[PDB]
Write a protein that binds this DNA or RNA. Structure first.
Ligand code: K
Ligand code: MG
Ligand code: MG
Ligand code: MG
Ligand code: MG
Lengths: 69, 56, 51, 61, 413, 129, 51
RNA sequence: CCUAUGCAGCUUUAGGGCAGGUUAUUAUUCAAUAAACUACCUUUUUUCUGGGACGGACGCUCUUAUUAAAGAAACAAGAGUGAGCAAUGGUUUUUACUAAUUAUAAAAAAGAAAAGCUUAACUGCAAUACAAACAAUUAAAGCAGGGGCAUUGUCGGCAAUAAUGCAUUGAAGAAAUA
């Protein structure tokens, strides 16, 4: 990644080493039947909503919408 | 009668009926029939475990 | 091959004897999916030998 | 079992491959015994190739 | 329909039984339910003020029997157990000795009870043995708590049961009636202020006649279970009814059969009750009770430890396994025992002649750690006796005894 | 209980008014097994939720009571009627249930009437026999 | 971190490969095991266990 | 008058919803579902611009003026394009030929046409450079495998300069786990 962008990520605390996280349930002898969860597909869609989305992907905060009544 | 949703009920006969059956016979009849005619007239009782042992 | 409870007994046996508790029992066998990963089933009190 | 079946299919296909190649080459060769354009002495060899090769391939298709 | 819709139906689960908390009763049965399930004195007072004229004999009895449960003890006099939940005979806390009621609840209970007592007298002749037993039990509870000093209707309740050679009981008696009558009378003669001389004579005379004629002669003890039999034994012990031992043997037999159902708080009561009565020939009964502490060690409290040790010393029953359990439990609960309580416990071990290393070792460590020790004459001799009787030697007990003597000499009243 | 209150506060303003009206009828009908059901709508293209109330279908019937020798008008839901028929009728329903479970003034008054009448007839019959 | 609207960081693809579970183990080098034995912190005359 | 992270009211055959009534279907002795009509709720309705509206325009190539290194803007000017080809690709032989493209002084050991055989319009990698805010975009010696035409040279599409679209979501072939 370009130097200017990389420093900002490091300055914010980005330290990931692998594409995903390891699964403790896969270690032999450490399988907990209670904490069973079928493997899910990772979501690739960023949250770009300017009201409740990521602050790093919008210029400024927008007012929330009205509730149905 | 379990899935009849109240439309069908088990009936215990105390006296001989023209079409429902004879005394002591446990049969299935429409809920409306028992509600309006058989029950108030005193010719039958609902097929509860206590009634079946006592009468059936 | 050690399980979660077995590993505790191996590392801290005194944690069980001081409380007068029996040590954890060892496993019977490992799942066949791990064949080629382990050679023997560990014993909670290891058997030491001379070298 | 699935791996064994898949290997069997590939082996059978490769056994028949040499014959398929021979037909592929043969179907695109001009048979001069069925050409009457030469008797006409009007068209070039390339035009003869297109006229008869296309008819043979389309009929086979 | 571009935007597809999914519909879910959510059912709102509600309790099966109604708690009469906010609605006003409008019927004979509804009023009874609201009174019975009342949660606070303000609710009971509100019901009486509004529906005063729509009351019957049953309504007055129900209100009286539930009032003792609405009077709560101080939070400072209760200690919560770790993870214990309400169950059959088990509470989530244990009470310190001589627990006091809440400061702001006494005037309310006294005021409410005075109104009830005023309107009750006309209904005295329409009571059944069940209703009489519950009233006696309720008043005994109301005397143990600082609500009343005497039962105005005690003379009438006792006469009603006594009439016609206990004819009313002969037809409408159950196991609960005998347990409540004896237990209630005991709490009306010992709790709080000691007694009146005339009251003591009447209560003791009635109990003796009731026990012999009903439970013994007519064999009504067949209606009693382990818990009810234990309650009767406690009542007899407090009344010091040591003359008749035939009933004591019968009650002990019932306890022996249903030993499994008793908790440590009930086993200790049996030990103390037998010790007070002096019945020490039932070694087999003692052995069965001792075997009940093996598994229920998590339900023992300092009161149970103190009672068990003192009862064993008085009875002369020495069980090494039971004493070992009490010593180890006491060693951890040293912070809960009082100075006077912990001296009696030490003396109990000395009388039995049992030396418990962990128990005495913990006590010696605590005493030495204290910079300034002040031992009172009331229990100074008890702690010295325990060390001498227990055989504690020069290791560190002489230093503890030395400090004990110095503190005693420091005052010498 | 906490979840029930949380759901109720999310109802549409008009659905709240309907809910209160339904609850105010408890003392006028034989509540029985009547229960409250909430309708929730979700959509695929947006993260929006709509909460609304599901009405109760009330039935007017006349059930026979041998103790009272009368056909008693009653307002019931289908589930309550099915339960009464299964248990053995109105008389068995009232005599096999405590006052706490009724949760209705109309039901409580009717039950109290039946219980008192049953005792009087039983006592007289018992003395005769 | 906002870049004005270009949003250049989210123009890259996503990978979903799961790393091996063995990344959760403690790694011990053979050269480090020997150094302890040479210094005298480990007894090489008897079986060495994880304890 | 113009400019906003703009606000509000009103209108409709702008998008979505059903939550009152009517209507349709179904079910129990005041009910459930809804691409309909009325009522109600909520949301959207670019920018550039010799001020704004109206009109026009938004990607990618060639050429003209700002000289003969490169680069260089305006609602400046003059022309193209959102493809085609199973040969119009690859490679050998022959010779009375040396053209054409949207536009253009490319090119003779080179091309075009004619005749023959072919599928490199490949699989897995790659030193070093051009350009460039970044993303991407451009040229490429060389190594291993399987091939084509020659018989030891060339082929990783087309004389060259345009014929295009990130991520996400969805789908297909195969393979590895669980
Ligand atoms: K101007
Ligand atoms: Mg503008
Ligand atoms: Mg770059
Ligand atoms: Mg070659
Ligand atoms: Mg080429």
């Amino acid at each position: 990644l370009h130097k200017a962008y990389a420093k900002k990520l490091l300055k914010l605390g980005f330290k990931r080493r692998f594409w995903t996280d390891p699964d403790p349930q896969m270690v032999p002898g450490f399988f907990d039947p209670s904490k069973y969860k079928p493997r899910e597909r990772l979501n690739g869609k960023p949250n770009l909503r300017p009201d409740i989305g990521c602050p790093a992907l919008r210029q400024s905060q927008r007012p929330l919408k009205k509730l149905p009544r | 009668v379990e899935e009849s949703n109240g439309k069908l009920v088990k009936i215990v006969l105390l006296d001989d009926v023209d079409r429902v059956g004879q005394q002591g016979q446990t049969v299935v009849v429409k809920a409306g029939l028992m509600r309006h005619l058989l029950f108030p007239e005193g010719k039958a009782l609902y097929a509860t475990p206590e009634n079946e042992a006592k009468y059936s | 091959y050690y399980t979660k409870d077995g590993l505790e007994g191996l590392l801290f046996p005194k944690r069980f004897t001081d409380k007068n508790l029996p040590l954890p029992r060892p496993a019977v066998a490992w799942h066949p999916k791990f064949d080629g990963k382990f050679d023997a089933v560990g014993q909670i009190p290891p058997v030491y030998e001379a070298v | 079992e699935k791996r064994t079946k898949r290997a069997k299919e590939i082996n059978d296909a490769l056994a028949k491959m040499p014959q398929l190649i021979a037909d592929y080459k043969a179907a695109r060769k001009i048979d001069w015994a069925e050409v009457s354009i030469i008797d006409k002495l009007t068209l070039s060899k390339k035009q003869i190739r297109e006229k008869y090769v296309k008819r043979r391939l389309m009929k086979q298709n | 329909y571009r935007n597809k819709v999914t519909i879910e139906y959510i059912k709102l689960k509600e309790p099966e039984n109604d708690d009469y908390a906010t609605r006003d009763p409008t019927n004979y049965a509804q009023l009874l339910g609201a009174i019975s399930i009342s949660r606070h004195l303000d609710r009971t007072t509100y019901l009486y003020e509004t529906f005063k004229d729509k009351f019957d004999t049953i309504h007055y009895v129900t209100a009286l029997t539930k009032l003792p449960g609405l009077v709560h003890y101080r939070g400072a006099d209760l200690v919560m157990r770790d993870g214990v939940q309400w169950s059959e005979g088990v509470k989530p806390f244990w009470q310190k000795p001589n627990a006091q009621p809440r400061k702001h609840l006494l005037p309310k209970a006294q005021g409410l009870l005075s109104k009830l007592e005023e309107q009750f007298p006309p209904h005295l002749n329409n009571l059944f043995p069940r209703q009489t037993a519950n009233l006696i039990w309720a008043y005994g509870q109301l005397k143990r708590k600082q609500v009343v000093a005497a039962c105005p209707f005690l003379g009438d309740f006792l006469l009603s049961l006594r009439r016609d050679n206990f004819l009313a009981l002969d037809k409408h008696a159950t196991g609960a009636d005998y347990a409540q009558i004896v237990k209630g009378l005991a709490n009306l003669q010992t709790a709080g202020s000691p007694a009146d001389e005339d009251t003591r004579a009447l209560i003791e005379d009635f109990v003796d006649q009731l026990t012999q004629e009903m439970l013994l002669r007519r064999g009504h003890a067949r209606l009693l279970d382990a818990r009810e039999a234990q309650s009767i034994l406690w009542g007899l012990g407090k009344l010091n009814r040591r003359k008749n031992t035939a009933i004591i043997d019968v009650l002990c037999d019932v306890v022996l059969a249903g030993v499994n159902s008793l908790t440590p708080t009930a086993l200790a009561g049996a030990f103390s009750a037998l010790a007070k009565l002096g019945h020490s020939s039932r070694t087999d009964v003692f052995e069965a009770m001792a075997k009940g502490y093996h598994l229920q060690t998590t339900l023992m409290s300092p009161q149970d430890v103190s009672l068990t040790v003192c009862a064993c010393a008085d009875l002369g029953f020495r069980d090494d396994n039971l004493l070992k359990i009490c010593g180890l439990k006491a060693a951890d609960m040293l912070g809960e025992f009082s100075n006077a309580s912990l001296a009696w416990l030490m003396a109990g071990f000395g009388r039995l002649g049992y030396n418990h290393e962990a128990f005495f070792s913990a006590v010696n460590k605590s005493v030495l750690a204290e910079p300034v020790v002040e031992v009172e004459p009331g229990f100074a001799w008890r702690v010295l006796s325990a060390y001498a009787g227990s055989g504690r030697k020069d290791s560190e007990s002489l230093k503890v005894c030395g400090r004990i003597t110095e503190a005693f000499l420091a005052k010498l009243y | 209980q906490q979840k029930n209150v949380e759901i109720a506060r999310k109802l549409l303003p008009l659905a709240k008014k309907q809910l209160k009206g339904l609850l105010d009828r408890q003392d006028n009908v034989l509540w029985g097994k009547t229960d409250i059901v909430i309708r929730k709508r979700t959509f695929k293209k947006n993260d929006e939720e709509l909460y609304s109330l599901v009405q109760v279908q009330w039935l007017d019937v006349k059930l026979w009571s041998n103790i009272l020798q009368e056909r008693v008008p009653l307002t019931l839901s289908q589930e309550t009627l099915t339960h009464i028929e299964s248990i053995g009728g109105l008389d068995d329903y009232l005599l096999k249930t405590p006052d706490s479970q009724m949760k209705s003034n109309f039901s409580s008054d009717l039950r109290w009437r039946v219980v008192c009448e049953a005792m009087k007839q039983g006592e007289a019959e018992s003395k005769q026999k | 971190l906002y870049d004005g609207g270009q949003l250049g960081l989210v123009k890259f693809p996503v990978t979903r490969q799961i790393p091996s579970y063995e990344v959760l183990y403690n790694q011990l080098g053979v050269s480090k095991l020997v150094e302890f034995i040479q210094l005298g912190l480990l007894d090489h005359t008897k079986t060495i266990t994880m304890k």
